[PDB]
Symmetry: D2
Subunit: 130 residues, 4 copies
């Protein structure tokens, strides 16, 4: 039941969210095999397209530290009627570093649904096709 640890960490991360345009804060906490946890939030830009997601910010922070072996990730948002699910782009970056690790799509209260990168990105495009 260490999932609990991640969830709180992703809600903490959500606090540093820079989303002045959508006002839709998002946080994520990435867990490596080593046991270290990397936090990330969405970072928008006046030119919407140049923004970045919370999952991407965590993965990129971890990869820049040398951690490329992930065990799981938890996403948090202020949405109530829906679990917070990663977008196609984020699912593609996750895929770059793993196919069988769990993604925790939470709700503000602590409830969540879990799916692996493969389940989220079936018949995925990947490194091997290049």
């Amino acid at each position: 039941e260490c999932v609990q640890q991640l969830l709180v960490c992703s809600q903490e991360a959500k606090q540093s969210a820079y989303c002045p345009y959508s006002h839709f804060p998002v946080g994520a906490a990435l867990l490596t095999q080593e046991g270290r946890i990397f936090k990330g939030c969405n970072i928008e830009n006046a030119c919407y397209p140049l923004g970045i997601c919370a999952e991407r910010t965590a993965i990129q922070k971890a990869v820049s530290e040398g951690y490329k072996d992930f065990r799981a990730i938890a996403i948090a948002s202020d949405m109530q009627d829906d679990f917070i699910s990663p977008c196609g782009a984020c699912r593609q970056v996750m895929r770059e570093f793993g196919t069988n690790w769990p993604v925790y799509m939470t709700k503000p209260d602590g409830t969540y649904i879990v799916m692996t990168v493969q389940e989220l990105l079936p018949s995925s495009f990947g490194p091997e096709d290049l």
Copy 2:
């Protein structure tokens, strides 16, 4: 058996591909409900991130023409041992305009596997969560 029509159109589209960096040409042919077909290819940039996929180029061309109701899309590449599958990002743009339409992931010879946007992007993030 009009799928044939799309496939050829996506291979035609693949010819205008501007991929000097990956040398990995990709074409796509989008079919609207009206029956019109929109072609697209990947367009790279020295700064890799600024590039764009073939599916995205077709959808964006169609949307800029007022077509937002899609019936199907076909992707073509020069890859042999794998069907050409859309990346997470492209699956997210498709989702923006439809959840139940077919995506034709072809092979150079004409063989292919088909899946809907939903199957490709399960538990998807979408407009409604905003």
Copy 3:
């Protein structure tokens, strides 16, 4: 080939804008050497990072159609105070296909200011750097 054409064409292009999130419509009119014009608009996505600008939509349309020349491009917005300037990303895609050509930053007023791709993105990163 002529300014007026670009002013009205980029203005019409703005009409197809798919921007339910920003409510900030943008249009683009890319004039090729041949004399053909390509219209483009901003096309947003529920996941902000996956939207795309009017200029890129226009350029991508052109390239996918075989045109990589470009004599000029005009941008338009519903912004009455100040001319819409392209975002750094667009300047970067513009540069991939030339650094001298003009970019017409306009106002609904019909009034405009013009700057070359090179002036918009000085000491730029490009294909030569490989």
Copy 4:
């Protein structure tokens, strides 16, 4: 706070670069007002459009950590002929957090050229335009 620190720190950052596709490593060292430095590298993806630059990786790391100030940033590459300049997209993300601060474009030589965010992206699009 000091040039030398940024030159070596951006150089180390380049070591974590995940660039199996371009084989073009890039490092970034963002100096915050506080005096803390954030390293970043380019992190590519099988789908080129989904990679991310060293500067954005560095900036995003910082912001997610609460820092939105920035006193300067240095870029580094294995490019011995010419200083690496940031791509338009990076300049655009840089601008979102200030337009005056310096950008140190370097050479493995230790030699460099410096230009402000504003000089790199003149007559820029920004948050004020909403």
